[PDB]
Amino acid sequence: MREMLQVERPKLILDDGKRTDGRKPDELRSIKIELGVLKNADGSAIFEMGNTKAIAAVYGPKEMHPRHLSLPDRAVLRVRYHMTPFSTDERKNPAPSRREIELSKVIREALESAVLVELFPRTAIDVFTEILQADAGSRLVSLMAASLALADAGIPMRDLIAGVAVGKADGVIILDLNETEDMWGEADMPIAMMPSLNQVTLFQLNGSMTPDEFRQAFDLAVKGINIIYNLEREALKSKYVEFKEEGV
Amino acid sequence: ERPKLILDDGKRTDGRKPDELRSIKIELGVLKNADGSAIFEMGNTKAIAAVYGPKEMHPRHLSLPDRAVLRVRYHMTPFSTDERKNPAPSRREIELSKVIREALESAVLVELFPRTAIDVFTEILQADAGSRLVSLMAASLALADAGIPMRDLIAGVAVGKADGVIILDLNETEDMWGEADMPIAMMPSLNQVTLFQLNGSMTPDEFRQAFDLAVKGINIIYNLEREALKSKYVEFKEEGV
Amino acid sequence: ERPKLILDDGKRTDGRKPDELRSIKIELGVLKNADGSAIFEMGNTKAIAAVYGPKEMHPRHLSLPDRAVLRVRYHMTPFSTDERKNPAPSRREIELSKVIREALESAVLVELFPRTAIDVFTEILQADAGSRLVSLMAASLALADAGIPMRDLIAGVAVGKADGVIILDLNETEDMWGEADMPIAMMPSLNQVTLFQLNGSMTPDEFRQAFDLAVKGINIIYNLEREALKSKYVEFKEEGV
Amino acid sequence: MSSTPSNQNIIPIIKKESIVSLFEKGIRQDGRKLTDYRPLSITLDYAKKADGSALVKLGTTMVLAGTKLEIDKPYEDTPNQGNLIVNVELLPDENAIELARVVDRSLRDSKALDLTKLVIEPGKSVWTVWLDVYVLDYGGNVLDACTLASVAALYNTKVYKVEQISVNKNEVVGKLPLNYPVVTISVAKVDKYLVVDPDLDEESIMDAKISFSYTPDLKIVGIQKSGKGSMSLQDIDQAENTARSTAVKLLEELKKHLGI
Amino acid sequence: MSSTPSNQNIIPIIKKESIVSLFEKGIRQDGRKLTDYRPLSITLDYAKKADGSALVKLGTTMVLAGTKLEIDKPYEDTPNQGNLIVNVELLPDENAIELARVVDRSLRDSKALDLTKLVIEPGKSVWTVWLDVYVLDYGGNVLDACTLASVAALYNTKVYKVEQISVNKNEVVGKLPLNYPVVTISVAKVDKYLVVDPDLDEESIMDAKISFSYTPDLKIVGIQKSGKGSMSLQDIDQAENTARSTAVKLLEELKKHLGI
Amino acid sequence: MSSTPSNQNIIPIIKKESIVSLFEKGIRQDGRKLTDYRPLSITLDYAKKADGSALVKLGTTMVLAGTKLEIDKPYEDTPNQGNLIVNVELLPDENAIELARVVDRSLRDSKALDLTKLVIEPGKSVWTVWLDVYVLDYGGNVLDACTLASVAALYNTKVYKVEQISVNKNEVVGKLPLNYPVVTISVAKVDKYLVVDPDLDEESIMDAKISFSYTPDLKIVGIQKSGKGSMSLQDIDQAENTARSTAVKLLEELKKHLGI
Ligand SMILES: Nc1ncnc2c1ncn2[C@@H]1O[C@H](COP(=O)(O)OP(=O)(O)O)[C@@H](O)[C@H]1O
Numbered sequence A: 001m002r003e004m005l006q007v008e009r010p011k012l013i014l015d016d017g018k019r020t021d022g023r024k025p026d027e028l029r030s031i032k033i034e035l036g037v038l039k040n041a042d043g044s045a046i047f048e049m050g051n052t053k054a055i056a057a058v059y060g061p062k063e064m065h066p067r068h069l070s071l072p073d074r075a076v077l078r079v080r081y082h083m084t085p086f087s088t089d090e091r092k093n094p095a096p097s098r099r100e101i102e103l104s105k106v107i108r109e110a111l112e113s114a115v116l117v118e119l120f121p122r123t124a125i126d127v128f129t130e131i132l133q134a135d136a137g138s139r140l141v142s143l144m145a146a147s148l149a150l151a152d153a154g155i156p157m158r159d160l161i162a163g164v165a166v167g168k169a170d171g172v173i174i175l176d177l178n179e180t181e182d183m184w185g186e187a188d189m190p191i192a193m194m195p196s197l198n199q200v201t202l203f204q205l206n207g208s209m210t211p212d213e214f215r216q217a218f219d220l221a222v223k224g225i226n227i228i229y230n231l232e233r234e235a236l237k238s239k240y241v242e243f244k245e246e247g248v
Numbered sequence B, C: 001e002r003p004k005l006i007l008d009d010g011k012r013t014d015g016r017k018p019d020e021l022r023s024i025k026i027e028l029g030v031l032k033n034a035d036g037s038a039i040f041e042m043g044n045t046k047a048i049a050a051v052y053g054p055k056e057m058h059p060r061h062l063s064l065p066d067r068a069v070l071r072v073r074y075h076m077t078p079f080s081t082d083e084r085k086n087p088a089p090s091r092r093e094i095e096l097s098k099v100i101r102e103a104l105e106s107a108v109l110v111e112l113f114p115r116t117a118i119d120v121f122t123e124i125l126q127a128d129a130g131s132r133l134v135s136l137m138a139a140s141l142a143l144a145d146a147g148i149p150m151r152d153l154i155a156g157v158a159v160g161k162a163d164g165v166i167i168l169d170l171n172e173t174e175d176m177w178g179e180a181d182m183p184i185a186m187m188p189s190l191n192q193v194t195l196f197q198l199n200g201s202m203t204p205d206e207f208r209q210a211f212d213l214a215v216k217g218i219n220i221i222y223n224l225e226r227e228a229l230k231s232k233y234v235e236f237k238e239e240g241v
Numbered sequence D, E, F: 001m002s003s004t005p006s007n008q009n010i011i012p013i014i015k016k017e018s019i020v021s022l023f024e025k026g027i028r029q030d031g032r033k034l035t036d037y038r039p040l041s042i043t044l045d046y047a048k049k050a051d052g053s054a055l056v057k058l059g060t061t062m063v064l065a066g067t068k069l070e071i072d073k074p075y076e077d078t079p080n081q082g083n084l085i086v087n088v089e090l091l092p093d094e095n096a097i098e099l100a101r102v103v104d105r106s107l108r109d110s111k112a113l114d115l116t117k118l119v120i121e122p123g124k125s126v127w128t129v130w131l132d133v134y135v136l137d138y139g140g141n142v143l144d145a146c147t148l149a150s151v152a153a154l155y156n157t158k159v160y161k162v163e164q165i166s167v168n169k170n171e172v173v174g175k176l177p178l179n180y181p182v183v184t185i186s187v188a189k190v191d192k193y194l195v196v197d198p199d200l201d202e203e204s205i206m207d208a209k210i211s212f213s214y215t216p217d218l219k220i221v222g223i224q225k226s227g228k229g230s231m232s233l234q235d236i237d238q239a240e241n242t243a244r245s246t247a248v249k250l251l252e253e254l255k256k257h258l259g260i
């Protein structure tokens, strides 16, 4: 009775076009952005994508502690991606995980392409980032919170950084993933851009994809990024933005 | 099953009245390769302290332009306790080090040695409560032995409440089962409180009593510190405050 | 339980007489991006050594005014042994590093490069005993390959005692169950002992025999090092001292 | 090895005299009297995935504290007790460790949380309360804000159904066994004045500060002197009177946020 | 805390212009076309005490990877799976950790190694595959060489007889449950050109590089953008076409080394 | 990663010649002959809470060593043995680790302590001897002082009643299974002279030193060459003759302190 065995993994695309959280494959989660929320930081921002909430603080161009570690021509970015023990369902150990170490390097390299470090030689810019709630896309929610906190700190950049995770769930390409979609989907592909320059700042894929899927997932991500970018520019003007989740 | 701590008339577990210090032993300049050294004993709590006197600081970016940087280490030897303490530093050793350093920073005239570091190492050889204070006093004396200028010497006792009775200078056992334990360290000649902590529970009125008793004890200890400075060696049998 | 070490014919576990070296393989300049490199193989013990040549030191306060600072790393790959050794450095790796550095410091003319650091990295790719010596020699050769001036080359063997018999160049098995294990490293042309250790047990008269034998072995190895310097590649089948 | 911090953020003698000259008139930079606490905001249940959380704004200082509950075997020494593990993190260690311990001590010694009610099957399985406190904005007097965030996070904590084996995290059984809130009041000694709840500026010009922990019936439950300087005998005496009459004010306000 | 490396040996504007002028003519310093891989050597069973090992020479880059097999209890979460633990070390961290993860991910997500076949007694005992990758010579494009050394080391691995509980290491039962090899192809974006398998010089002048992992049926199995700069949309598109048509040739060559 | 120490103190060429000119007349600064040990003090059970302790003064060098006994499960590898864990501290690492290992090795390989006698229940429970050695005063030749403190601390150790489940620490059963004491003798090579037990000054001008460990039966039980220089063949030969005829005198004296 192989006859009654039925896959353990849950269906991610359900009735109508729709998903586990009731979204269509081409809909973002709800977005909330707030700037200058920390008084003692040089620039700060809180970014929420659905249930993923990150806070980012920037401590603005300053002379570097041990001078041998500074750069003669550039500022040194110091980036910290970190998850609070209560960001997840079960408790994440506060001691840094190899995954946190990798994500920090990837986020730093992302910001390094946007921030004009060639303006502040012998200085260090410190970008701290906590994840207060993790529900997937947290490396992107973190990166964007950072980008905005930099802009809030008044630090010059080529462009703002906007990003979505695009994926494939039940053979269907979907935009902005749940933890559930991240768990059980075939593929999970975070993409971050400087939208006005069309420059890809961060780009990863874990999972499996055919070259064409990859290219479709690619076109959907851009569209999502473009909608998020608009809110970032808005949030820069008015310091506070709230966007109900909806179709790209 | 808890122990009775003050038995029906006055006497504690080690046969002391509520207002009696443990025996004190101090000797100075006991380490030959240190700039200043001291061993301090309060009953069964021994501590040794070495000072390595004002010197240029290793990585110059960590030095201070106007001040000396104090570097203080509180540490317990694995064989200082009943159960073998792990040599790797404990959160409690980390906190006690910060507390002791801040204590010494109020006494030592650091603004006299800019761009220098004064290193104060302290090890507890026997732990029987009050070890943070025995450490601090050993340090203070080792600094004086190193001939480093200070506002005053530091003297200190732990005062506590047991069976509802306020007691002076606690046991291993009194720290363990008493309702309160309040270490106090002073610069007695200036009436300056250098270190002050309380773990446990007290009413505002008993806090003020415990406070008064601690001062009296400190004054007696201070006198021995002063004697130990001139003669290098001091013994003192348990006595009433 | 417990194995035999020399057999009824007088041969060891790997079929060698008590006075025979393992097979030797040396090749130089094997790493492209290093300033000097070498692979050394004694029987089953293979070590690779890279040198990153005299260079301005990172944090200048750690440099020396008159000398170069040697920076030496002895390390075993997780797959060098039979049961996977942890990559995190062991107390044994930490000691061996210090011993190897002090060995190289006696040979390398550090006087010549003040305010600089010479890096010597060493990995063990297969461990079958004598790995601290195979490492040291690989390093010595890598330095010579990096064209760094030295008093002499360093050659070395582990001499030991199996079942009451003094033997030259040990197996993991002989290291494991032998009564003594004595690594010796020399600057053969100067008759200078660079490294010298003994773990196990020996009578003074035995110690002196094991010593003489070690010298003879060292002399044969030295010749191959001198060789390998001139031709970059040397093979040597096991033979009698 | 504990050493004098070289990021000693020095504040000029001239600016110090400006602030002291105001103290002499019983007023401060921010407008409050020598004995006033800063404006206090508490948002409960801020971190949604926590068992209970609280975001506290005391002036410009911000602390977020969150609890996370687990089922562990009780430790061999204390077989009929649950566990409380406090952990502090500064974001802008040693001061963190000290903050953690001071908070822990005052929550434990007051018995504000009763650990002996966190037992499920004695000797077999107990609740472990993970308290994690995150300082997001260092606006001075972090300790008092920590105690507040902690207490609030504990009062916001939801306990779940214990399926007999593990935890069923969508059925809420009840709250934590909490006897009462606890407040910590820091009094700074700047010059010859005693100042309640020092801000960023006041902390950098102070000699030392002393912190008193109180239960609602005004029992002293923890004291911690702190700072590179010293304080006189009648200073500590006076400080505690001030600290205590402040405590009453702060407790009623904490309770209003905490829903009685 | 991740910070811009203060090492990173800067390469003058004049030397960059020399290399780019060659790119414009579709040739490089080495001599190869913009899309060519470097010369590839693989020596199997190099580390004799490993269960399986492989020494890879891609250009001047040298990676040695070795496997070591062990029997442990499967981890409470994954009761019907063996373990794969990848570990990278640079010898001439953070880049190491990133390298380890990228390789791991592409070996695990492709299911090139089937962990569910490394079970001995389900829930009781499983195989743990320790993969350790050692970069001996940093000649640029270390990632591609690592993937090769890894895959090769796994294909060289020998599994031993199990006493059921105890390993008998001189009887060889079989090989690892390997479905297929995997290749990673890195494409660098130098100025306005895309360059396959960048060497040491090319990596120091590039804006960013992007790395594609492929299974033999040409499914993308991992992508990693890497480097201090950015890349355009059309660039990543083109890169992947180039990356994929390279993968075919590299796979055929890898297989020749691995014997079928 | 082991590197040449940058902050130990260089000693001028002029001062070196002064000391050597004295060696040339068979006398040293302090007054002793080239082959004499420094004055030796041993105070037993100095640390009262230790299960056996010894404070050793050799010249200006001071070592305090203390033992602490515990009951554990023996190692899966060594089921019929107790444990000895040596640990060295320097207070005024790497030299510490080296010191610990050299002492451990000579106590273990000599069989001075018989570990197979520290078994209570074979395979179930054995004694673990924690030996902790604290260098308080670095007066040169720390190694020799360490071996002495260690041996003395073990000879002072009290074993307790084993009461089933636990230990009853106020009933003394006996003392450690010790076969014999062990001495380590360090011989420094300064210039062209061999000098027994070098002091602080002699160690900083020496080429290298070599340390020999002896059982009372004058069997060599450990050798450790140490120092940033080299030694000739005849030097090591001569060194050991001197080292050994010294060992007899030092063993005598060690025994007198211990109560034979
Ligand atoms: N230690 C952990 N405990 C619980 N959940 C975790 C842990 N680490 C990661 N997660 C969950 O996995 C989600 C997705 O992680 P990942 O694929 O790295 O993407 P992102 O980092 O963009 O969220 C996280 O947002 C979080 O919900």
Ligand SMILES: Nc1ncnc2c1ncn2[C@@H]1O[C@H](COP(=O)(O)OP(=O)(O)O)[C@@H](O)[C@H]1O
Pocket (backbone or CB within 6 Å): B081, B082, B083, B085, B092, B127, B128, B129, B130, B131, B132, B133, B172, B175, B181, B183
């Ligand atoms: N980890 C430990 N194990 C056993 N006993 C200890 C330990 N730590 C401290 N003690 C003993 O109990 C006392 C309690 O210490 P505490 O009150 O925290 O500080 P202090 O060391 O100043 O007394 C110590 O003085 C010591 O005698």
